[PDB]
Structure 1
Amino acid sequence: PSDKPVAHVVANPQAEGQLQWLNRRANALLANGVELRDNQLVVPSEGLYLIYSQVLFKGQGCPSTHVLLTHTISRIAVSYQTKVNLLSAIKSPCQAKPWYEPIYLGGVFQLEKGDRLSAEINRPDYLDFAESGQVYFGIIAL
Structure 2
Amino acid sequence: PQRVAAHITGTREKALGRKINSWESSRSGHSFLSNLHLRNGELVIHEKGFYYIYSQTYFRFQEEIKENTKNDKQMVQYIYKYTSYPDPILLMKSARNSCWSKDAEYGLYSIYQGGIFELKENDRIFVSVTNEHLIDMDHEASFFGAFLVG
TM-score range, shorter-chain basis?
0.7 to 0.9
* Percentage of identical aligned residues: 25
Mapped partners of 1:141, 1:120: distance in 2: 22
Shift of residue 22 of structure 1? 1.5
Q: 44, 48, 51: which is aligned to 1:49?
A: 51
Match of 2:87 in 1: 82
Gaps of 5+ in 2: 13-17
Alignment partner of 1:125: what SS? Answer: helix
Match of 1:98 in 2: 106
Higher radius of gyration, 1 or 2: 2
Deviations 1:27-70 (Å, cap 9, x if unpaired)? 53101x20001110001111100000001111212543311111
Gaps of 5+ in 1: none
The 1:18/1:80 distance shift into structure 2, 3 A limit, reads closer
Shift of residue 18 of structure 1? 7.0
Contact 2:19 2:127 in 1 (8 A): no
Q: 133, 142, 146: which is aligned to 1:135?
A: 142
The 1:22/1:132 distance shift into structure 2, 3 A limit, reads closer
Aligned residues: 134
TM-score normalised by L of structure 1: 0.85
Equivalent residues in 2 for 1:12-31 (5 A)?
A: 12-13=11-12, 19=20, 20-23=22-25, 25-26=26-27, 28-31=31-34
